[PDB]
């Protein structure tokens with residue numbers, strides 16, 4: 001039964017989260033775990049820190065550059081008693097386009113856990129192995145394990161150190177419409193980035209337009225490559241501004257009635273405090289969302 005969606009995100013082990021379109025509330029999300037294949041677990045924390053396995057980040061990044069935002073179709077081969085769905089995703093509008101699992105195994109960024117589907121995966125794995133790609137390269141793959149830091153040591157120094165020069169980063173999670181979790185590169189600091197000069201509504205049951213603000217920002221920036229101006233800090237959080245070619249998310253959120261200009265932190269906004277007050281004034285005059293009567 002061929003189903004359809006957009007890629008919301010790609011996870012640890014290249015299980016992919018697929019979403020639909022919303023119809024009164026945020027979109028329905030499904031987490032598909034790729035059938036017949038195995039990729040590494042990414043780094044994670046619990047009792048202790050545990051690092052990236054070999055080749056897990058490069059696998060995640062491969063499907064991320066390739067898939068995020070695109071329209072896929074999928075098919076659910078099984079549903080386990082643990083509450084998980086296994087299946088195959090095809091990057092296109094049909095079950096004969098580009099099987100994403102075949103891309104992984106040909107790059108050597110995954111492996112197999114007879115029939116046409118299983119034959120195609122073999123043909124990919126033999127090629128990858130016979131061209132020394134990914135995990136079939138000479139070595140242990142230690143150069144693919146990120147030196148992942150969960151906290152910045154001296155934050156004021158760290159921000160002062162970059163002199164407001166944008167830092168390439170990946171936006172890994174959206175807590176609410178105005179605070180994100182940003183993977184900074186090339187040092188692999190995973191940290192909390194609050195948008196300088198604004199505040200969206202927030203999750204506790206949630207304030208009006210929190211879920212809407214979260215979605216607005218999340219569908220535009222989750223698992224996208226961005227640059228961040230690190231402007232100041234609040235505790236172990238980075239006050240900053242996000243750059244992307246399509247626009248300024250801070251300037252939009254206010255302009256679209258999803259945010260209010262907060263007085264303290266707007267002093268550190270480098271891109272120009274007049275524009276944030278202007279876009280709020282745009283929303284307020286138009287009676288948009290948080291400004292309705």
Ligand SMILES: COc1ccc(Cl)cc1S(=O)(=O)Nc1cccn2nc(C)nc12
Pocket residue numbers: 219220221244246247248249250252256
């Ligand atoms: C992946 O895309 C994005 C990344 C970052 C930002 Cl800040 C915006 C976008 S966007 O092009 O998707 N949206 C929009 C762009 C411009 C104006 N509007 N107005 C509405 C209502 N949306 C947009």
